[PDB]
């Protein structure tokens, strides 16, 4: 039930796959972010927890050119650093 | 519960990296939603609408579109294209 407002870079990512608002729940941000990775085909086909984002907005958001979705702490770190809690 | 997808559904799952011929229902649903997003078949504005024209998914559904809100229709489509173990 916590509402967040993504900062411009994160908001640009969500809007690129159809997000229409400025305010979201954390669960909604996670849904769109996973949608972004699949829509842009950034996951490894063989070991599908690996994401390659070096030439992508996601990599600017993460601070690294690749990561594994198993790094839950890093994912939450990136998201919370790029939003404003309401 | 284990299911074995029929050839066409198996072809779809394999196109997004599925490696087996036997799965749980949850795994099939995960890969199927992944397929729709990876192939960008959802409507950008009303994202419960999925477009299946000229796509493997349209053969599986027998229809050129469907709504994700139609849960019974989705399960009907899936169960018609697998064999429960």
């Amino acid at each position: 039930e916590t509402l967040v407002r993504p900062k411009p870079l994160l908001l640009k990512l969500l809007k690129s796959v159809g997000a229409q608002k400025d305010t979201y729940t954390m669960k909604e941000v996670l849904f769109y972010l996973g949608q972004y990775i699949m829509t842009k085909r950034l996951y490894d086909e063989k070991q599908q927890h690996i994401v390659y984002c070096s030439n992508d907005l996601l990599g600017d958001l993460f601070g690294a050119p690749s990561f594994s979705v198993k790094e839950h702490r890093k994912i939450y770190t990136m998201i919370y650093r790029n939003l404003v809690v309401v | 519960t284990l299911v074995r997808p029929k050839p066409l559904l198996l072809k779809l799952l394999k196109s997004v990296g599925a490696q087996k011929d036997t799965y749980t229902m949850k795994e099939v649903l995960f890969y199927l939603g992944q397929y729709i997003m990876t192939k960008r078949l959802y409507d950008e504005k009303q994202q419960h609408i999925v477009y299946c024209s000229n796509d493997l998914l349209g053969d599986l559904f027998g229809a050129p579109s469907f709504s994700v809100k139609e849960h019974r229709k989705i399960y009907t489509m899936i169960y018609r294209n697998l064999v429960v173990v």
Binding site: K27, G34, H72, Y76, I79 | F30, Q34
Partner: peptide
């Protein structure tokens, strides 16, 4: 394991 399931286990 699909990316979707991996992602569902950070939504």
């Amino acid at each position: 394991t699909s990316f979707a399931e991996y992602w569902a286990x950070x939504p």
